[PDB]
Structure 1
Amino acid sequence: GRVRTKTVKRASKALIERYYPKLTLDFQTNKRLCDEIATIQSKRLRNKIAGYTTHLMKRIQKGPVRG
């Protein structure tokens, strides 16, 4: 499956909790901004966190969400 784990989901939560007046819903800018705002130890993990952050931004734009 493509179920994102806690290591990805919680990191995306924290990024969105502190950087909402920040990175938009574009994945490329989201990941390039994760590159500077977070010390992620693998390109794959940073890609996954950025993708989940983009997902959460897109789902916020349709209304708010828990967390």
Structure 2
Amino acid sequence: GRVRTKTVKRASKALIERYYPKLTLDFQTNKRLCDEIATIQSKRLRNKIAGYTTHLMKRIQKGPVRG
């Protein structure tokens, strides 16, 4: 399966909480953001993070998301 862990979704949350001006529906540029806008540690985990901050960003456009 590919259920993303809590650290992924946790960081994702509070990224979307304070940087909605900036970010998009584009993973590619949401990625580049995370380098500047946060400190991660891994090339992998950073995509795995940015990917899911991008998913949320996507659905929020069609109605709210809890948390």
Q: TM-score, normalised by structure 2?
A: 0.96
Structure 1 residue runs without a partner (length 5+): none
User: What number of residue pairs does the alignment pair up?
Assistant: 67
1:11-67 deviations in whole A, cap 9, x for unaligned? 000100010111111000000001111110000010011000110000101111111
Shift of 1:6: 0.5
The list of structure 1 runs, each at least 4 consecutive aligned residues, that deviate by more than 2 angstroms after superposition, is: none
TM superposition score normalised by structure 1: 0.96
What do you get for the CA RMSD once the two structures are aligned?
0.6
